[PDB]
Structures are given as structure tokens and as C-alpha cells.
Design a protein around this ligand. Structure first.
Ligand SMILES: CCNC(=O)c1cc2c(N[C@H](c3ccc4ncn(C)c(=O)c4c3)C(C)C)ncnc2[nH]1
Length: 168
């Protein structure tokens, strides 16, 4: 039903909220929820772990079956699979992990995958333990994504820093 509420409007197509993406999926019932994935779709940590546990491991079982037949994704690439009880679809997107020396230019390719979907609920790509500068990730999102994106950032201090920086 895509019932997004409580978001700050950054641009005509980008919105942001201090929220847990799992609780937003449950409230919103989005057509697409984005997972901040890795290339072998191992959902043990961070956002991926939180989404998988909220599906009672159904997302990991589906992902393992996908990987056995298709192999891993590339950094900057994506894969649409079921959204299970959280969304109609889950768009698994691999942003570069700069803490492991991956190419930051691939963050643009990662966000370009969002343009295949009219509206998405998403986390801030390559942020947190992936090490990219979160202000840079938001700028890449705003400059790359043309479709409607609702960003859930589960950290009040980070949310306030991003909003303050964007409003300069
Ligand atoms: C209480 C259950 N929910 C969560 O743990 C949770 C965590 C959530 C979250 N995390 C953000 C984030 C973004 C990109 C990432 N890319 C790769 N990896 C490995 C991450 O762990 C990762 C994490 C950080 C930057 C705040 N963003 C929204 N919603 C959330 N929910």
C-alpha cells in the first residue's frame, strides 16, 4: 500500500526519516524494500540481519537457493527476490564496502538499480560498517535516483547530521 508517513522531503523524489527500516516495512507495506546486501547474500549483520530475522529466516533460505544456482552478485549490482511478509519484493543491492577497500565510484551504480522501481523503502547505502561517508552517500542518492525513494536512517545523530548538511 506504500503508506509512508513522517518523512522530511529533501527533493521532489527523495525523502528521509529517523527510523528502523524493519518497523517502516511493517507499517508501510511497501511494494519494494531495499536490503543493504553483500555479494553472496549472507544476511548475518546490520540491516540485512534485521530484515532476515523479521522474515523468520525465510529471506536467507530463498537467498541461499538463488546463490546456489546463479552465483554471487557484483559490487554495484542488485537482485529482486521475494519481500516475504515485509514487502512485495526485496531489492538486494550491493554497495561498495570502503572499509574492505572496495571502489567508492560503485556507489553510483548501486543507487542506479533503484531507477527500475517506481517507489522504494531503502537504507543509506554503504553507510555504517561499510564505511562510506554518509553525507556523500546521500548526495549520490539525490543525484542518481529519479524514482521515489524513502530513506530510513536508524540513528538519530546521523539523521540530524545528514539533514543539517543537506540544508546548507
Ligand atoms: C532493530 C533492528 N533494526 C536494525 O538493526 C536496523 C539497522 C538499520 C540501518 N542501518 C544503517 C546501515 C546502512 C547501510 C549498511 N550497509 C551495510 N551494512 C553491513 C550495514 O550494516 C548497513 C547499515 C546504519 C547506517 C544506521 N538502517 C536502517 N534501518 C535499520 N534497522
Amino acid at each position: 500500500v506504500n503508506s509512508f508517513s513522517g518523512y522530511l522531503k529533501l527533493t521532489d523524489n527523495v525523502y528521509i526519516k529517523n527510523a528502523d527500516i524493519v518497523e517502516e516495512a511493517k507499517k508501510v507495506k511497501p511494494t519494494v524494500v531495499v536490503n543493504a546486501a553483500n555479494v553472496y547474500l549472507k544476511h548475518g549483520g546490520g540491516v540485512a540481519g534485521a530484515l532476515n530475522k523479521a522474515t523468520n529466516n525465510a529471506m536467507q533460505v530463498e537467498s541461499d537457493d538463488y546463490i546456489a544456482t546463479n552465483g554471487p552478485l557484483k559490487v554495484g549490482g542488485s537482485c529482486v527476490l521475494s519481500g516475504h511478509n515485509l514487502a512485495k519484493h526485496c531489492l538486494h543491492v550491493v554497495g561498495p564496502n570502503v572499509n574492505k577497500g572496495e571502489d567508492i565510484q560503485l556507489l553510483k551504480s548501486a543507487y542506479e538499480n533503484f531507477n527500475q522501481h517506481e517507489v522504494l523503502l531503502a537504507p543509506l547505502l554503504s553507510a555504517g560498517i561499510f564505511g562510506a561517508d554518509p553525507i556523500h552517500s546521500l548526495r549520490v542518492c539525490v543525484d542518481t535516483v529519479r524514482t521515489n525513494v524513502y530513506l530510513a536512517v536508524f540513528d538519530k545523530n546521523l539523521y540530524d547530521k545528514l539533514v543539517s548538511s543537506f540544508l546548507e
